[PDB]
Structures are given as C-alpha cells and as structure tokens.
Design a protein around this ligand. Structure first.
Ligand code: CA
Ligand code: NA
Ligand code: NA
Lengths: 347, 34
C-alpha cells in the first residue's frame, strides 16, 4: 500500500512534468501565428484531451497520448491517465486556500445514443455533468450551453459558443477556475501610471503596481532575463520571466523547457526587494484543431478517427473542432484566471 | 534594495507547487489590451 502511494505519486510528478512540456510546445506553436498577448491552460488542454480519450480507442487514442508527451507514462494500467487527473482533482479540491476548481460538461444531442460505459467513466474520473441538447436548433443550443458555462465561470466567459454545427453529436466542455490571492498583496495606494516599453522605439503608459517585501528571484546570465516568483496562498505561484534586452534577441519560447524552469527554481534567492508589476487583463481564444495536428495529434480529426467507445451503435464520428478560451485578470489582490475548452464531436 | 521593474514584455506561468502542474501560461507584450 505504501509502495502504491509512492508509485502513484511518481506517476503524478511525471504527468505534471509532461504537461508542462506539452504546454511549452503549444505556446511555441501559438506564437507562430500570434505576435501579441497570449494566455492558455496547459492543464486544461491535457484534461480536455484526456476526456476525449475516454471516447477514443486504438491508434486514435495512442496518438493523443504521444501528442500530450505522455508516451510511456511509468505504468500501463487501464484508466491510469484519467485516474491521475481524478486523484489530482480530489487533492487540489481539498486545499481550500488554493482557490482552484474544475469541472466538466457533456452536451449531448437528444437523438444521439451514447455508450453507458462512457457516461460511467466520465462521471467516475471527471464528474462530468450530462446535458441533453438539440443541436439542430442553433440559437437554443448556443444559449443553453453559454448559460451553463457562464454560471460555472462566474460570468468570466459569458459566451464560449457562437456558431453551432447542426451535425454535432456531442460537445465536451472542461473549465478551470483559479482565484489566487497574493501572499504579499500590492497596496493600491501606490499604483500609478508608468512607462512600459512595447519595443525599442515605442513606449506606452500603464497602471503599474508596487510591491515591497521578501521575494524570490534570479537572473539568467545566458538569456539576460530576470525570473521572479510571485507566490499566492495555498502553494501556487506565478513565475514571471523578463528579458532585459529588446531587439533581435532570442525567442524565449524556442528554449522554454522544464529543465530550464527547474534551473531557475534551483537558483532562486530570497531577499527584500521592490517589485513593480503592471495590472493586466487578457482574453484569448484559439482554435486548436490545426495546432494540435502540428503536434502530431491527427487521426481524431480525420475520418479514420475511432470513437467507438462513445456511440451505442456506430463510430463514423470525428472531432471537427477544439477551441480554448482563457481570461486572466491581475491586480493588487491577486490573479483570477478561467479557461474553457470545448471539443466538438460530429458525424 | 534591489528592484525588479516589469516595464517591458514578459512571460508568465501559474504553477501549483505540490503537483508542479502548470495551470496557466502566457506572454504580455502590451498590458493595456486583451
Ligand atoms: Ca463505476
Ligand atoms: Na501515430
Ligand atoms: Na518571445
């Protein structure tokens, strides 16, 4: 029993490490087509793809696991991966100071017969709530789904859905909601508009927060970047990476790995210092269909997709669309961030 | 007292420290828009 716990712990460490690397690979892909602000949830994406794997089988499923950097996760047991997210969800749900909740919906077309084993496993691992839905009534379907997601994101993602493919048989939606409070809040009195350099030539004036206190930081001589920890309550933290130099310099995304991140954490020093950190609000959405194919996840989006763990009869289903939308607000009290990820399954 | 001045584009990661799970990952090149 003690050995099962140690082993499940090693497996969870591996899942986390690989999900971080998946995240960095995906950021890199997103940054090929987007030159501005970016934000998304690596955790949410892996959780969403793992949800889909319950419906998939054979090479369709295995290619998803490779794409998630989860090839040869230390065990080869049935349900191992979703059981890891379940175990991870139950522990993260217990730390009340963390402020992290998650959940899952399955919106199912009213005439589409689904395998009960699918419902059983989804409920077991992701506590998925099943909501029958008429997808041939576009505006009704849009409103109902949006209400559900609006409620569970506490209004931070009011309209995840716009267009409704009338051939949709199932939409899986995962959400993650994080409300973190800073361990050392910024006092709003000291927040003033200051200069932020957009590039070597242009500046703009932005609300800039002041923090004073013990903070962990380090300077990476090689990238010429400062790396700073901004901890929250309940053992979460934001890592901020700031390049000193703007110009022809290195795309950090090309070198971001867990090895590098661990090098920075290994070399952190704590000291009294002042931090000036801007307020910000992002709201980014990405169709992931094509990026994921760029990471080798392909069969699930093709007419070869095997999603016969899903249909009571007949798999001629595929995933037409995977969309994530993420909002984040940073201010003197903390950070609130919400991610909603949808996968649409069509005949 | 040392200063870190985040007055230019940056990356950010939000991690849960026990699991090491990366919850949110991004880049801010301009903090006045979405
Ligand atoms: Ca059962
Ligand atoms: Na393959
Ligand atoms: Na960059």
């Amino acid at each position: 029993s003690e050995e099962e716990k140690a082993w499940l712990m090693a497996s969870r460490q591996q899942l986390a490490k690989e999900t971080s690397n998946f995240g960095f690979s995906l950021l890199r892909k997103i940054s090929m087509r987007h030159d501005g602000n970016m934000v998304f949830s690596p955790f949410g994406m892996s959780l969403a793809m793992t949800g889909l794997m319950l419906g998939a089988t054979g090479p369709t499923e295995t290619q998803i696991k490779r794409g998630l950097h989860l090839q040869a996760l230390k065990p080869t047991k049935p349900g191992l991966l979703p059981s890891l997210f379940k175990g991870l969800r139950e522990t993260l749900s217990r730390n009340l100071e963390l402020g992290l909740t998650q959940g899952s919906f399955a919106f199912i077309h009213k005439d589409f017969d689904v395998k009960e084993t699918f419902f059983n496993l989804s409920k077991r691992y992701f506590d998925t709530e099943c909501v029958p839905m008429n997808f041939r009534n576009a505006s009704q379907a849009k409103r109902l789904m949006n209400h559900y997601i609006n409620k569970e994101t506490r209004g931070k993602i009011p309209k995840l859905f716009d267009e409704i493919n009338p051939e949709t048989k199932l939409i899986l939606v995962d959400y993650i909601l994080f409300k973190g409070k800073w361990l050392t809040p910024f006092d709003p009195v000291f927040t003033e508009v200051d200069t932020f350099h957009l590039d070597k030539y242009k500046t703009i004036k932005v609300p800039m927060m002041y923090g004073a206190g013990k903070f962990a930081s380090t300077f990476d001589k090689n990238f010429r970047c400062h790396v700073l920890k901004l901890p929250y309550q309940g053992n979460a933290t934001m890592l901020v990476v700031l390049m000193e130099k703007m110009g022809d310099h290195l795309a950090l995304e090309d070198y971001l790995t867990t090895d590098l991140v661990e090098t920075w954490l290994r070399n952190m020093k704590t000291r009294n210092m002042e931090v000036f950190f801007p307020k910000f609000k992002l709201d980014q959405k990405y169709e992931m269909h094509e990026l994921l194919r760029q990471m080798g996840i392909r069969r699930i989006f093709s007419p070869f997709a095997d999603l016969s763990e899903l249909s009571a009869t007949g798999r001629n289903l595929q995933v037409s669309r995977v969309l994530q939308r993420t909002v984040i607000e940073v201010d003197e009290r903390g950070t609130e961030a919400v991610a909603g990820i949808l996968s649409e399954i069509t005949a | 007292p040392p200063v870190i001045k985040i007055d230019r584009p940056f990356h950010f990661m939000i991690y849960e420290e026990t699991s090491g799970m990366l919850l949110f990952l991004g880049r801010v090149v301009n903090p006045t828009l979405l």
